[PDB]
Amino acid sequence: YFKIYSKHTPINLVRDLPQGFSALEPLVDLPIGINITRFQTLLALHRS
């Protein structure tokens, strides 16, 4: 099972992580049943 927990927080700090407490609610449980050992973030380009 792939558990995804998430939290959205409105912050106003410029650079680093803010210092505080925020518990993450469970969002979605996925019945995947597969081996995972590596991950990669996906970004978006801006074209002009």
Question: Which residues lie near ligand NAG (CB under 6 A)?
Answer: 35, 37
Whether the Cβ atoms of residue 7 and residue 26 lie closer than 8 Å to each other = no
Least separation in angstroms between residue 35's CB and ligand NAG is 4
CB-based contact 33:3 (threshold 8 Å): no
Taking the complex as a whole, how short is the minimal distance between the CB of residue 45 and ligand NAG, in angstroms? Answer: 31
Given a contact cutoff of 8 angstroms between Cβ atoms, the answer to whether 29 and 6 are in contact is no
**By beta-carbon distance, which residue lies closest to ligand NAG?**
35
The two three-digit tokens of residue 20, written as one number: 């505080």
What is the smallest separation between the CB atom of 37 and ligand NAG, expressed in angstroms?
5
